Amino acid sequence: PQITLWQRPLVTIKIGGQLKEALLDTGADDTVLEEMSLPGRWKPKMIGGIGGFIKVRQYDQILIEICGHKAIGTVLVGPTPVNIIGRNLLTQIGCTLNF
Amino acid sequence: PQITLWQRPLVTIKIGGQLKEALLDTGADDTVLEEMSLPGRWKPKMIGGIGGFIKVRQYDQILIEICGHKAIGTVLVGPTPVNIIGRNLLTQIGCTLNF
Numbered sequence A, B: 001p002q003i004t005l006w007q008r009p010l011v012t013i014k015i016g017g018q019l020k021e022a023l024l025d026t027g028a029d030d031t032v033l034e035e036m037s038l039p040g041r042w043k044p045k046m047i048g049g050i051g052g053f054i055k056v057r058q059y060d061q062i063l064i065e066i067c068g069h070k071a072i073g074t075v076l077v078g079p080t081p082v083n084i085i086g087r088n089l090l091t092q093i094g095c096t097l098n099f
């Protein structure tokens, strides 16, 4: 799909058997999702954005379905206001910017 | 131009007679540039990002050149780590997401 930017670029993602909406963020290096029930082990980690830093939990090789496109990568879980799909997962679904 | 996401989507912008690099951020509603010499009036404003909020100064109808494409719109100035070009300006240079 092509996506204009008049509205937030929100998509439907399936991660860990659950359905959620996330924002495609070309400006995020990482993918950060709000508190959720995820299976597996993890490691503590601090990450920054505008406003400061937040503590999240790192989960590697997690399966995720973004608009039907499957991908496996690191996902971070913590106190984020919105679910953010970063370039780590965006490169995997062949997502480009165009103008 | 088409832009893959393996590297940060950094572009060259000309704003206020000065040259800078900014990140094309599909996940930013607004355009936030780091402290810089801008002409005109402004209004105080708090905005949010992942780690909390930051106080910036709002400047409306500012001219900006992103990769040769001219655009006029609101730009926010404050303690941001990187210059962010938000959807307000991205819609103006006809920028889309694709996959």
Ligand SMILES: CC(C)(C)OC(=O)N[C@H](CCN[C@@H](Cc1ccccc1)C(=O)N[C@@H](CCC(=O)O)C(=O)N[C@@H](Cc1ccccc1)C(N)=O)Cc1ccccc1
Pocket: A025, A027, A028, A029, A030, A031, A032, A047, A048, A049, A050, A080, A081, A082, A084, A086, B025, B027, B028, B029, B030, B031, B032, B046, B047, B048, B049, B050, B081, B082, B084, B086
């Ligand atoms: C997700 C991680 C991995 C933490 O990366 C980034 O945040 N990357 C930033 C891209 C921008 N991504 C979004 C992430 C986001 C979005 C929504 C909510 C929470 C987080 C953002 O900060 N967007 C801000 C950019 C500044 C701006 O637009 O004014 C935004 O759109 N904020 C809105 C929406 C908002 C409201 C309240 C709270 C938070 C956000 C606003 N109106 O202030 C760039 C960056 C890189 C490194 C260091 C600092 C900054």
